[PDB]
């Protein structure tokens, strides 16, 4: 049906925008602390602490399968990355401090993207 095609065109456009948003967000992580999942090999207890791990590559996998239906969903995953890090790691660490900076820098990008998604539909 043509209604379905048009829904699909709207999903695809959302995806193109969310990719741009992701690249922007990832540029606020020049160190690549958040680029890949935490290794269970190198932090074996991680899943006793963090119930829903998240990272940029995993977000990128989901994105290219158009698995984000809206910006809320993508914002949830982004917030997991930050929030997982600020729980697992202590306040005086390079990891925690990179989360804070990503949150603050990310908040700007996400402030405008919320307008571009409303405004463009």
- The domain limits of the chain are 1-121
At 37, list the tokens. Answer: 């999942």
At 15, list the tokens. Answer: 């995806």
Method: X-ray
At 33, list the tokens. Answer: 């602390």
CATH number of the 1-121 domain: 1.20.920.10
Task: Give the contacts of 18 (CB within 8 A, at least 6 positions apart).
Answer: 63, 68, 71, 74
d(CA 56, CA 68): 14
Query: Resolution in angstroms for this experimental structure?
Result: 2.3
Task: Calculate the alpha carbon distances from 32 to 18, 45, 108 in Å.
Answer: 19, 22, 20
Task: Give per-residue burial for 73-94: e unless 16+ CB within 10 Å, then b.
Answer: ebbebbebbbbbbbebbeeeee
At 35, list the tokens. Answer: 């680029």
- Max distance between CA atoms of the chain, in angstroms, equals 56
Cβ-defined contacts of 60-64 (< 8 Å, 24+): 60/22, 63/15, 63/18, 63/19, 63/22
How does DSSP assign the chain, residue by residue? -HHHHHHHHHHHHHHHHHHHHHHHHHHT-TT-TTSSPPPTTTSTTHHHH-SS---HHHHHHHHHTT---SHHHHHHHHHHHHHHHHHHS-TTSHHHHHHHHHHHHHHHHHHHHHHHHHHH-
d(CA 33, CA 54): 12
Chain mean position to CA 51: 16
At 68, list the tokens. Answer: 């984000």
Residue among 16, 29, 11, 12 at smallest CA distance from 78: 29
d(CA 83, CA 96): 9
Task: Calculate the alpha carbon distances from 51 to 21, 33, 65, 86, 94 in Å.
Answer: 25, 19, 23, 14, 22
């Amino acid at each position: 049906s043509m209604e379905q095609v048009a829904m699909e065109l709207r999903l695809t456009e959302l995806t193109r925008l969310l990719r741009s948003v992701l690249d922007q967000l990832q540029d606020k992580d020049p160190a690549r602390i958040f680029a890949q999942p935490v290794s269970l090999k190198e932090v074996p207890d991680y899943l006793d602490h963090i119930k829903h791990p998240m990272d940029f590559a995993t977000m990128r996998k989901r994105l290219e399968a158009q698995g984000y239906k809206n910006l809320h969903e993508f914002e949830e995953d982004f917030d997991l990355i930050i929030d997982n890090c600020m729980k697992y790691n202590a306040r005086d660490t390079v990891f925690y401090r990179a989360a804070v900076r990503l949150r603050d820098q990310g908040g700007v990008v996400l402030r405008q993207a919320r307008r571009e998604v409303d405004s463009i539909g």
